[PDB]
Design a protein around this nucleic acid. Structure first.
Lengths: 140, 177, 246, 65, 67
RNA sequence: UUACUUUGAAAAAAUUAGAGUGUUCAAAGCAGGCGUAUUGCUCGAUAUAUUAGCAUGGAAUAAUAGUAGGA
RNA sequence: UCUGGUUGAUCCUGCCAGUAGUCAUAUGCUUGUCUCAAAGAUUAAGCCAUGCAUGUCUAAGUAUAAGCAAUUUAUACAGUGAAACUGCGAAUGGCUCAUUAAAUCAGUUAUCGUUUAUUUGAUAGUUCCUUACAUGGUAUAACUGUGGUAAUUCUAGAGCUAAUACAUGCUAUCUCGACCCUUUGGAAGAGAUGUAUUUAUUAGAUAUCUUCGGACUGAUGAUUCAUAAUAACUUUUCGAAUCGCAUGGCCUUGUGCUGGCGAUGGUUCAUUCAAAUUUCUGCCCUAUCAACUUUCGAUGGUAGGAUAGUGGCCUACCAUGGUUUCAACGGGUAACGGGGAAUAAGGGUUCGAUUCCGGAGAGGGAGCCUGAGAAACGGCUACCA
């Protein structure tokens, strides 16, 4: 359901005229986040309300773009990915494995499972630790 | 007193960050203006840049807009009914954003009479309005959502609650009573 | 610091000023103005260290308060005014106009200029926009706001500006095959024709340039500056015409 | 808050400063050329050391580089 | 170093206050003078030896009654 | 597809390594000089991924994806 | 990194002898010239006598100084100019490294997430709308005088008088155009017309004849962007009651109408000097430190408050999350970070308070005023020493 909270969830400044009777009983606003990211038809014809969905919310995707492997999906509307990389120790002339767990928001227009490869884009600080936004999910 | 830096919180990993500097002026906070309902009384705060910012301590009237008719009238705010953050604000009659107040309805029904040639209660397709809105007109107060930030601009401007929001907040009021 | 700096050390200064490192601790911090800090020449640096028309900052004050120096048609009296790139500096008693333009070695270059060439000035249209009351304007690379431009003027396009009226005389599009001056980066001062704009989204668009000895290099769109068509520079280039050699 | 003038040491003591062959070498040089100092002979030997090191590296690099 | 021995703690009054608060909140994970120490240890050993002496004497009394 | 490699842009000056120059030599310091100056002539002013990011060329190596059945 | 010594001579293992430098740290003796140059250290970022280190005026904000110059065109002022009001600056510079170990910092990004004095370029006729604009009104300083006090850059009562102080405030242009007669158009008539704050709504989309002469919105990779329009709202802004030099053009001869150069100011937008957040990756020793964070916000969701603005920044109500054997957390650091300095063949190792860049601090907790800019300390307040 959509109205599961104390306030009325809505798209701000988007107004559906009650005296005007149309087919689609709501008026939904959606954009495309650029950079060749196909906006999903579930976000076009969905019913959720999300301030931080990069296709429907007031959040721009800009600057850096990362890809990662999802690790945990237990909190509401945010996941945690794990980027892995090889650091180079010039003394021993060889490498070592490291990792950084970057938490990242996920729109309700996406279905992630623990183990797939997602593509995230940097947005303005959503929360204390969430600066990225999931924009293209891929299976594994 | 208030400051809003992020150097006094725990780390993301769950560590305690030691202090890095004294508190700075560009991360100040100020004391909330618990704006209540009374005669108009408004402070002016000087803000970064030289910019004025009006705080409201008590404000009676307000500007409320009927969205379905696209008009706006100045009405008198009666009292706060619902507020999704704190029923203590509901109790103490605090005027903030997203509050649900009851307003006077006489200027709206006067405009309706002078515009559609028809009274309320008791061009016909244009004259037809919603049933709950007609019930509120018969009652004498209208439900309206405040959409201004009266601790920042000092204005209480809102819009009259239209169909879907009125249904949701009517369910909320009746369930919470 | 708790506010804006007002001092510039000698070694902190931009390198291309050719300020020698023993004559003091401070270099003329160029006041806020049309041009950015790291690519501006103050009038004290120009009149003293380059033209040798002054021996002291007090003589530069004497000249400017005598009101001889004019920078783009108007009298300046602030001795650290930031006279930048593609500038017209006219000294009337000496009967000289100077186009300020870069040399091949990466430094600024006095360019003696006649009256009919000093009468105008190029400017890189950099931000085209729609202002209040619905009028359009262009913002060139020296802060010059010009309302009511031609409808075909886009970003990164050169506009030849008549100085004494502040108006747009004409303009030069940004296509492949135009003559491109490069202003920042490693290759600044190398005049070459633009071959190909390698265009990325969200990144920086690079530009492949090829100059008269058919040498090829890559810069960014921020450093590219269009001058004119093939073999027809609208301005008169300095000696060597911008060619880096061995 | 000035810029530092650069200074440089012009000579350098050799590896083994006491050695009979080199002592007689410097005696021959000083008495023959009218010098006064192991400081002077080390000045010249330092210049020549720098020159010959540069030349050796340019030898080891490729011809027509 | 966070917990050193400074020169003037009487001037570092508030410094020591915030350092002690920091130490408490940090090592909440763990919590949740030597000459005097020698005299304390030898005092404990002496009084314990005297208790051993008294219990020894009353066990001697016990056995001499029980014979 | 990536690692890895090549090249390019980027990596403030000072410092370092180099080129010129008779500071009287030197440690230093600095960045043209001549003309029929009414249209020209001459030389030097270069380099410094060491990891991350950006763009690009790959034929190996090391991971990494993707033919089958029936009538 | 090597050399000497055992034995008739020889080889390895051994033992001893021998060797090193160090803008390293103290110290001793000597010290004539020329050029150049530094000038911290008790893990004491411990304490200060005195002196100085931040003020400022152009022709152009305010002079009736009972200041000076007389004096020659100046009976409002006109030269120069103390004092004081006003404006700006004092937030830069200078010193030190105490704190801080993904913190500062280096390289790389972002602001489609914000403020910006100044500089620079643009920018505002709104004509009317029922009962002074040849230019409204108050004060106050300095000053005169009466005083207090051991004392300080202490100031009280009383009488003046100014402003670019403070507070008030009024002064046609487009579109269509029947006609007419045709050019060089001019015309009855119809119609419209500031910014600023706040809210609501809307737009901001783009897969045939000839008199040969004429008729049949933008940008980005992307936006709720720029911009425009509607209806109201405001203890509500702005739309010049300012200043210097000169004196020309007109003529209904009014002391009438007009007029040059330039100084200060002012709404918005852009620019510049900035500022605050911000993405990736990179820190020395410690596992005889293995679990840590959440009442007291730890991780996320929704709404609000607050801020210049994003954001658990904070308050509610909610879910139980977040980090780690790839070393979390906590401990030590005689730990400011970097460019850089020394050394060896390469690899590395050790220094870097110290001429440049950045951050932090002004005996130590805390708090604020003014201002575009400060949590300022050669600013103010309370506590401790």
């Amino acid at each position: 359901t959509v109205q599961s909270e104390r306030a009325f969830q809505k798209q701000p400044h988007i107004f559906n005229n009650p005296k005007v009777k149309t087919s689609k009983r709501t008026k939904r606003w959606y954009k495309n986040a650029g950079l060749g990211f196909k906006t999903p038809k579930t976000a076009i014809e969905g019913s959720y309300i999300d301030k931080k969905c990069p296709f429907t919310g007031l959040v721009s995707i800009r600057g850096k773009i990362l890809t990662g492997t999802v690790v945990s999906t237990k909190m509401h509307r945010t996941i945690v990915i794990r980027r892995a990389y090889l650091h180079y120790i010039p003394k021993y002339n060889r490498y070592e494995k490291r990792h950084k767990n970057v938490p990242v928001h996920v729109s309700p227009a996406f279905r992630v499972q623990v183990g797939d490869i997602v593509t995230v884009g940097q947005c303005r600080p959503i929360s204390k630790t969430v600066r990225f936004n999931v924009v293209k999910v891929s299976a594994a | 007193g208030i400051s809003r830096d992020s150097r006094h919180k725990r780390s993301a990993t769950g560590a305690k960050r030691a202090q890095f500097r004294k508190k700075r002026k560009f991360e100040l906070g100020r004391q909330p203006a618990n704006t209540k309902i009374g005669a108009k009384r408004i402070h002016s705060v000087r803000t970064r840049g030289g910019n004025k910012k009006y705080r409201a301590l008590r404000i009676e009237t307000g500007n409320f807009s009927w969205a379905s008719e696209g008009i706006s009238k100045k009405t008198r705010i009666a009292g706060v009914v619902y507020h999704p953050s704190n029923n203590e604000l509901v109790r103490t009659n605090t005027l903030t954003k997203a509050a649900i107040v009851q307003i006077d309805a006489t200027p709206f029904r006067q405009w309706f009479e002078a515009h559609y040639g028809q009274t309320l209660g008791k061009r016909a397709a244009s004259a037809k309005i919603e049933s709950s809105v007609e019930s509120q007109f018969s009652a004498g107060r209208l439900y309206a959502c405040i959409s201004s930030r009266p601790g920042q601009s000092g204005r209480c401007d809102g819009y009259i609650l239209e169909g879907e929001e009125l249904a949701f907040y009517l369910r909320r009021l009746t369930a919470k009573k | 610091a708790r506010g804006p700096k007002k001092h510039l050390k000698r070694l902190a200064a931009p390198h291309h000023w050719l300020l020698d490192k023993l004559s003091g601790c401070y270099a003329p911090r160029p006041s806020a103005g049309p041009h950015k800090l790291r690519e501006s020449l103050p009038l004290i640096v120009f009149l003293r260290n380059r033209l040798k028309y002054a021996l002291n900052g007090r003589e530069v004050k004497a000249i400017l308060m005598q009101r001889h120096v004019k920078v783009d048609g108007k009298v300046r009296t602030d001795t650290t005014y930031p006279a930048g790139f593609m500038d017209v500096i006219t000294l009337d008693a000496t009967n000289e106009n100077f186009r300020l333009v870069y040399d091949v070695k990466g430094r600024f270059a006095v360019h003696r200029i006649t009256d009919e060439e000093a009468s105008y000035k190029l400017g890189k249209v950099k931000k085209v926009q729609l202002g209040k009351k619905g009028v359009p304007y262009v913002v060139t690379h020296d802060g010059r706001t010009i309302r009511y431009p031609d409808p075909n003027i886009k970003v990164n396009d050169t506009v030849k500006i008549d100085l004494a009226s502040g108006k747009i005389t004409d303009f030069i599009k940004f296509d492949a095959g135009k003559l491109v001056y490069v202003t920042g980066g490693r290759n600044l001062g190398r005049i070459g024709t633009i071959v190909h704009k390698e265009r990325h989204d969200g990144g920086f668009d690079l530009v492949h340039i090829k100059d008269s000895l058919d040498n090829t290099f890559v810069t960014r769109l921020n450093n590219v500056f269009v001058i004119g068509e093939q073999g027809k520079p609208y301005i008169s280039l300095p000696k060597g015409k911008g060619i880096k050699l061995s | 808050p000035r810029a530092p003038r650069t200074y440089s040491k012009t000579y350098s003591t050799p590896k083994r400063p006491y050695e009979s062959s080199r002592l007689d070498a410097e005696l021959k040089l000083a008495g023959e050329f009218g010098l006064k100092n192991k400081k002077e002979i080390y000045r010249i030997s330092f210049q020549l050391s720098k020159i010959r090191r540069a030349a050796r590296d340019l030898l080891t690099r490729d011809e027509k580089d | 170093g966070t917990y050193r021995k400074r020169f003037n703690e009487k001037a570092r009054s508030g410094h020591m206050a915030k350092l002690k608060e920091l130490k408490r909140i940090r090592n909440k994970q763990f919590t949740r003078s030597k000459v005097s120490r020698l005299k304390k240890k030898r005092l404990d050993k002496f009084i314990e030896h005297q208790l051993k002496r008294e219990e020894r004497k009353t066990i001697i009394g016990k056995l001499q009654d029980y014979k």
